[model samples]
Target: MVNSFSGYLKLTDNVYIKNADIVEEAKKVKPTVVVNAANVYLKHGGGVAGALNKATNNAMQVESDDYIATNGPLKVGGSCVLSGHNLAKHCLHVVGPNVNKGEDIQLLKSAYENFNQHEVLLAPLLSAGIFGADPIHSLRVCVDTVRTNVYLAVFDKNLYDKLVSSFL
Candidate 1:
């Protein structure tokens, strides 16, 4: 499997690319926060969220439950901050838009933009999985939207190589 980020590829002064698992990176680096591409309901069911739920021993589930029960469902491009129990100091649960017919780039941008600049921040290219966004496009959006403290933790070699090819 594609594993750790050996070094960084600078996209901008702040944004960077690394071939690594988001959950693992958070655990190792102890970033200020790590992001999850989550559903509007904040359900920690599958993919990144599922991995995080396991990594944190279902702490995300309890946090999400309490937050959503108080605040209701999250909006597309909105984020709900959940306290980090294991992986990182905080988990940014961002809701990326579900794209089917056409891509809404702004919604994706806002999802990435909502977080503040901190010591280090790790995020997947939002919505590249079951949300059905084009991975390359997501990478580009990330470069444009994310801040200086951000790290783009790409989980696959295919996307990693393509990110270097297309963006560099």
Candidate 2:
């Protein structure tokens, strides 16, 4: 018996991965939390973060920057959660490693590990966009680290098809 979420592959009793429009899927899942790969300043400048900012009417960026102002700059592998403001229940902004700075898989692993929220997490392939990490490699790190219900949103059709065929 399939259900609304059956399209996703179950990585564990909790973890799941699906290739779809991130914003569209977010609407359906209404995940407890959403995760975005952000920069040290917590600015949603580009990549998945930028997309999220635009989708949520810049609320995600506003909340993230406000948090940084009260606290400090987000460090690589560090994270901060922001209220959904109608996007999701909450959003986890993780400072992804700067690939151009020589950070590698270890850094990516750390970012994923540092994210405290595991239940009902909706995340993209972190650092695989403007940050410049390889999508396949990034996806591996994410799949290996997530311990709860996580929806990996893939925006590219080719990559999405390949991942679903290979993993699911």
Candidate 3:
């Protein structure tokens, strides 16, 4: 059986990849900002979003809800910054397109690219879950678009292994 591996793969001086427990990373935290693959309403319920909500003691989601209350639901491929908890200084919630939308790749790229301006961002592969995106395709956009001080954080053991195999 393949071992569960957790480590970093440097794509460049600024860009690095990490195959590790996302909840743990969120607890420990870095890059001053963390990206949450959120629903259009910015609700942090289920999947990575749910896990993050618990990890931060609902600090992330509470803020997300407030943002939605003020600005309305975020559009697909759209993103917004929010106040993070002690774990991180900034939080970003991005809504990626579902595969049924036919613009999955472009929307995924936009999701990642929207937050690329941050000095450093802790991110995961968007649309790779129930959103119906092929994780590999999601991985490609994540790798291609998010340059500079970014951590391509993958939480799933199987997907992380494939990412390393395909790129490392």
Candidate 4:
């Protein structure tokens, strides 16, 4: 099992992914919502989560079209949001920040407070492979970033296996 602490910028078990279809799995869990990366490799200042290229405005209501900023020391730039495909439930877009020592806590707080009651909040690394992050560091940062108690699912099995196989 992975663990996290305040000294670090992320937490283990903070965000992860399993092999099953995200939408189907979400339905099985009877979750209030299901978050997704509508498409991979979203550019800076683009797309809501699960629904790529659908975010037309940032200040608008954050339902299925608002793009929240995912800024940090490691990001290339800009924001991300939730997608608009899943007709079964609410699809949230979590703009998780990159790992940095002097990062903004309020943004983190805002995201958590905004979606505190949701059954689950799903997020990948602020920038995963494209941002030159090592999976371990990403997982740790992701874990520590969350201030609330939530379920995290890693998208990469190798990363998942590495954590699960470790002695820690």
Candidate 5:
């Protein structure tokens, strides 16, 4: 069984990956914020974004896309904060670089930097979605970049297994 605080890593004093469902884990931890390295378009239709949308019953998508339309197509290293609706107190949306274009760890790094609030944060493994980044690599980048208590929501069982096997 996956422990409640499984797949741990002390990337920093506060940062770690407790591989679990982001919303459920966050509810347990009661984090002040959640963040995601998502598409610049902010379409929460698939991957972690989609799961988050469903977790909040599509409320996140409605507000997030509207915010994106008003101010987005955010650059690869860009980020913006939005109301979490029901999932979190706040949500930070980061623009992930297209892996087919090129893998830029700096862009992912910048997203964490942009959303550095020094509190508990829940985030999906950055760039490891339809964006085509390797889950292991993206998870590593997430660990190296954050300065808060980050719980990595590893929704993919295969990816979660790989991470635990390696990290543990």
Candidate 6:
């Protein structure tokens, strides 16, 4: 619990938000499967979804053709990864929770219930909504409510990537 990872940031135990460093972890771990929680954002490319797509492809050294945008488009319910994008071995885009909707109990319940025994769940933040909140508030919710361990990564690409490689 609460350990500094690669000098970029601290990770509690089994949870994480989307960041550049985590992307590196995705690359090094070469995880068999990646679960991406879905969201709709026009400004930040892929937001959480976009980050996963880029990292998976970048890790495999595959062209990141699947991710429509590094920072993505300004649209709702967008999944940047193409149907045939092989950049990642497998990506699961999860859609739940809604902007202005507080406490996604059902979504969280389903997430915890459908939790894959093998696959690691990578989140951008507890409530780091692509359509809504910021990191600090999201962190608070994640720590208080969620059961899984989280590895909070640096927002910066280089630092975040480094952290993942070192930890995974």
List candidate 6 segments past 4 Å from native: 1-19, 40-45, 54-92, 96-120, 126-129, 154-168
Off by over 4 Å in 3: 1-6, 12-14, 100-103
Model 5, stretches more than 4 Å misplaced?
Answer: 1-12, 100-106
Per-residue lDDT tens digits for candidate 1, residues 1-168, read 852344778778878888888788888877778888888888888878888888888988988899989999998888877887888888888887768635465698787777554456788878887778888887777777666567888888887988788884
Q: Which pairs, if any, clash in model 3?
A: none
TM-score to native of every candidate shown: 0.88, 0.86, 0.85, 0.44, 0.79, 0.46
Give all candidates' CA lDDT scores: 0.79, 0.75, 0.75, 0.39, 0.70, 0.44
How far residue 87's Cα lies from its native spot in candidate 6, in Å, is 7.0
Models, CA RMSD each: 3.9, 2.5, 4.9, 9.5, 3.9, 9.0
Rank list by lDDT:
1, 2, 3, 5, 6, 4
Model 5 lDDT tens row, 77-128: 7777787767677878777766866757567677656656646667777777
**Which one is best on TM-score?**
1
Shift of residue 72 alpha carbon in model 3, Å: 0.5
Instruction: Give model 4 RMSD, 1 decimal.
Output: 9.5
How much lDDT does candidate 6 score?
0.44
Largest lDDT belongs to which candidate?
1
Q: Give the TM-score of candidate 2.
A: 0.86
Clash count per candidate? 1, 0, 0, 20, 0, 20
> Model 4: residues >4 Å from true position, as ranges?
1-21, 37-88, 96-119, 122-126, 129-132, 166-168
* TM-score of model number 3: 0.85
Candidate 6 lDDT by residue in tens digits, 1-168:
753333334445555544644456545544444445554332224555567655544432133332434654323322333231342355444443555555353344343333334334434442244535444444554555556544454455664454445543
Q: Candidate 3 on 1-168: residue-level lDDT in tens?
A: 841223668766655677776667766654478888788887787877888788888878778778888899988898888776765677787888877556556778888787677877777778877667988887777777876567768777788788778863
- Ten residues in sequence with the least summed lDDT for candidate 5: 2-11
